[PDB]
């Protein structure tokens, strides 16, 4: 029984007697181990003895000693030494810890050797003592019908054999089981797998299971194509639509891919798809024609500007230079965005004449936000100010070429050849200041039209503008080249534009180059660290400004603790208020995924002696919390509203305007205090100048698009980071430093509508749902789950957040599929009985085509 004398008798002869001696020891291994541990070195010495054949049973004894000694690493070695006595299926606290310890050490070596070889799990690169328990644990979880621990550990183990082989045996094909399995693999691996190559294969292997399209989830396969940006998988989706013929399923795939894909993937869906055959109904869909048509028509049906509250805002004073006129013009241009209403410019004469020279840019560019989405008459709005028709002056003429950039952005291939010809004419030299103004709006318009597509002609045309060292259009040339270099970009253009920033020192140039060097690196993560190190080591104020946005864009989406430590040390050690403001704003772009921890960090930075630090955290809080929940961020911005600093209250009103969209009517109790401050701060002369100027746009953002459009960034509809939405918010960070850039914000405003259309072509009918919904669209600025139906759930405005409780009635000619898919841009639900009257109403969308 007592193992103390037996362990000392193992140095004698007759090894057959030692077999019987070890039998009585296995009882006290969990009892006397604190005593017999003095004889433990004799147990380990016999394992290496070639004449000792009892190591099979001797390994079990030593496995329970070192473990209870407090060494978890040793318990794995002695347990797998024999590879026989160890039983993983036995349920005890001794085995479960050894299994969890072997997996923990296996993840550390899996994240390293994966770079050299991806086949390491099939090879000897890893010592089998790590993979022995790791393989037996997965097989034990598969027999227990538990996919939480099996799939969760597989993502940490970085092994492709587990997910690929086990999924084939677990196939239940309802057919909704395989959809949730990938959803558990997609959601967890993003915050777990640190290597973009491993998660690239997980989405690729899952494509071969659903490739047959047995009424499976297309949104799951769409997120695979968008994340991988593969041209072969995008074309393969339409290859299966030719075999299985469905008008409803093939449509929803086409509307979804055109919005989330970049300019490079749209060429495969149009040019490459035409060569291999296509659907005549789906060709125009992938070209973006219906996408812009839905945004313009849905806003025109229900439109409330409420000019009564706006008249009192813009009639206060004619002075304060353009800062008052710019505030009311940029704000009003948001309310009519997409509805094509010129009443501010046309119906009101005096507010246009009171503007200054450079102030006429906002009055002209306001129509670009208003008429955004018009691919036909968008040029006729700027027709009198186009080149060759001259203009009232050359300061206002430059805004016309920029107005075409906001409307046609991404569709501006026709204007791409038109806008670059004006740059070549002015590329020689400039004799006047307003000449660069015409080049300023031209370079920004072609940058938006070519945004997302790499063009060597636009890069070389704007490169000659940088050589001229223009104090006005110098930033426009840098921003135009950065939008073409979005994504991986050109590595040669990284060091070239960085060299011109050190050679040419200018405020409007280098600052634009610093932002341009941030746009060229998008989603590169550690690949952009070479440029980040050069900016952090330099003491230049403008180079440190672009260093934060370079970290913001590359490290966005999935959060990274390495990018947090960089932005935190810069906002503290550096004494520059503009750089501290850029570091706290750059933190919000990395936190876009998790909006719950964003206010907690802002509360820590809400108390500071610097105004720019509190001003940066104000707008950075509203970036991630715009279209998300957690209404408590309003109370965080309350003390910033009382800040005597002028520009802090300006960014505070804008941040409040982003979170409070559609929060009225007994949703957020703070909507009463924000609506009073609209007319109170403007009319009162005791407040700050920039405070009332920001309250104008603050009232204009909540009323933008006629109370309809909302700011959607990193949602379930897109599936990834929106390129147009993240760039527009960066431009807002520069307001009074040079000239308001707020016109770029129009890319983030999208309406909220739910409509089925048809299964073939454009319809926009009129029907009713009557499902549980909050009261929003019928609550406009004036002069508990009860399962109770709402007035009309079709179209209107409402809210995307609380619309998850809205169902779809099946009593009409349509049928529900996703049970409120909840996608406002894609829409186009399934029609089970086409060619039947829907009570269709033809919209004005023909004018936008």
């Amino acid at each position: 029984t007592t193992a103390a004398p037996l362990l000392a008798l193992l140095r004698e002869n007759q090894d057959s007697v030692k077999t019987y001696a070890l039998e009585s020891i296995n009882n006290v291994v969990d009892q006397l181990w604190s005593e017999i541990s003095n004889e433990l070195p004799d147990i380990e010495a016999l394992y290496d003895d070639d004449t000792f054949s009892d190591r099979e049973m001797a390994a079990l004894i030593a496995s329970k000693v070192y473990y209870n000694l407090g060494e978890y690493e040793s318990a794995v070695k002695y347990a797998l030494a024999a590879k026989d006595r160890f039983d993983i299926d036995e349920k005890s606290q001794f085995v479960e810890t050894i299994v969890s310890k072997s997996i923990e050490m296996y993840v550390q070596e899996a994240s390293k050797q994966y770079t050299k070889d991806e086949q390491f799990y099939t090879k000897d690169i890893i010592d089998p003592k790590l993979t022995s328990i790791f393989e037996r644990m997965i097989e034990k979880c598969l027999k227990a019908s538990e996919l939480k621990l099996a799939l969760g550990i597989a993502l940490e183990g970085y092994r492709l054999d587990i997910i690929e082989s086990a999924l084939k045996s677990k196939l239940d094909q309802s057919t909704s089981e395989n959809v949730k399995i990938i959803n558990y693999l997609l959601t967890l691996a993003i915050t777990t797998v640190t290597n973009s190559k491993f998660r690239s294969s997980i989405l690729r292997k899952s494509f071969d299971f659903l490739m047959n399209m047995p009424n499976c989830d297309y949104l799951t396969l769409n997120k695979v194509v968008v994340n991988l940006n593969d041209a072969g998988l995008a074309l393969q989706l339409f290859k299966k639509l030719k075999e299985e013929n469905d008008e409803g399923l093939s449509a929803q795939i086409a509307f979804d891919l055109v919005s989330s894909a970049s300019q490079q993937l749209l060429e495969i869906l149009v040019t490459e798809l035409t060569a291999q055959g296509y659907d005549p109904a789906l060709l125009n869909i992938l070209s973006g024609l219906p996408t812009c048509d839905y945004y313009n028509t849905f806003l025109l049906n229900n439109k409330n500007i409420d000019i009564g509250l706006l008249n009192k805002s813009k009639s206060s004073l004619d002075g304060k230079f353009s800062l008052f006129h710019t505030a009311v013009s940029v704000a009003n241009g948001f309310m009519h965005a997409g509805t094509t209403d010129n009443s501010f410019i046309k119906a009101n004469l005096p507010w246009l004449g009171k503007a200054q020279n450079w102030a006429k840019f906002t009055a002209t560019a306001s129509l670009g936000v208003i008429h955004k989405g018009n691919l036909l008459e968008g040029k006729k709005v700027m027709a009198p100010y186009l080149p060759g028709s001259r203009a009232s002056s050359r300061f206002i003429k430059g805004g016309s070429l920029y107005g075409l950039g906001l409307i046609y952005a991404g569709f501006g291939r026709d204007t791409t050849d038109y806008l670059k010809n004006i740059i070549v004419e002015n590329s020689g030299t400039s004799g006047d200041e307003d000449v660069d103004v015409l080049l300023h709006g031209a370079s920004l318009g072609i940058g938006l039209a070519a945004m997302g597509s790499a063009n060597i002609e636009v890069y070389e045309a704007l490169k000659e503008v940088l050589y001229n060292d223009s104090a006005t259009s110098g930033e426009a040339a840098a921003l135009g080249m950065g939008l073409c270099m979005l994504g991986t970009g050109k590595p040669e253009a990284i060091h070239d534009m960085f060299t011109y920033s050190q050679e040419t020192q200018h405020g409007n140039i280098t600052r634009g180059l610093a932002v341009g060097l941030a746009l060229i690196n998008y989603g590169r993560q550690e690949l952009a660290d070479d440029l980040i190190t050069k900016m952090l080591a330099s003491d230049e104020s403008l180079l440190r400004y672009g260093g934060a946005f370079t970290i913001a864009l590359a490290y966005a989406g999935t959060g990274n603790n390495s990018a947090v430590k960089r932005l935190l040390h810069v906002a503290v050690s550096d004494s520059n208020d503009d750089v501290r403001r850029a570091a706290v704003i750059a933190l919000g772009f990395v936190l876009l995924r998790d909006y719950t921890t964003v206010p907690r960090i802002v509360q820590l930075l809400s108390k500071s002696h610097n105004a720019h630090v509190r001003c940066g955290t104000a707008f950075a809080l509203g970036i991630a919390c715009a279209g998300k929940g957690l209404q408590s961020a309003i109370d965080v911005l309350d003390p910033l509203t009382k800040d005597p600093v002028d520009f802090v209250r300006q960014a505070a009103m804008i941040a409040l305007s982003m979170i409070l969209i559609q929060q009225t009517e007994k949703l957020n109790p703070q909507v009463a205090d924000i609506n009073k401050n609209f007319l109170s701060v403007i009319t009162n002369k005791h407040q700050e100048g920039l405070a009332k100027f920001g309250a104008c746009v603050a009232q204009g953002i909540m009323n933008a698009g006629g109370r309809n459009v909302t700011i959607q960034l990193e949602n379930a509809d897109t599936g990834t980071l929106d390129t147009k939405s993240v760039v527009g918010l960066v431009m807002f960070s520069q307001f009074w430093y040079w000239f308001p850039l707020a016109h770029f914000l129009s890319l983030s405003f999208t309406p909220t509508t739910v409509i089925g259309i048809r299964g073939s072509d454009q319809a926009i009918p009129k029907f009713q749902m009557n499902c549980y919904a909050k009261e929003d669209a019928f609550s406009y600025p004036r002069m508990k789950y009860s399962s109770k139906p709402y007035k009309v759930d079709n179209m209107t405005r409402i809210l995307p957040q609380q619309s998850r409780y809205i169902s779809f009635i099946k009593d009409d000619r349509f049928v529900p599929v996703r049970k409120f898919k909840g996608n406002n841009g894609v829409v186009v639900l399934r029609d089970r009985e086409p060619k039947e009257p829907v009570a269709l109403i033809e919209t004005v969308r023909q004018m936008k085509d």
Binding site: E96, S100, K148, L149, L604, K607, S608, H609
Partner: protein
């Protein structure tokens, strides 16, 4: 499922370490409001 629970217990232990930040932040705000 015990591997996740035992690991989560460390977060609750480090939660009391976050309490040390409130003592330093309030002492820092007293110096900020003073200057």
């Amino acid at each position: 499922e015990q591997k996740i629970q035992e690991t989560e217990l460390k977060i609750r232990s480090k939660t009391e370490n976050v309490r040390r930040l409130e003592a330093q932040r309030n002492a820092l705000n007293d110096k900020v409001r003073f200057i």
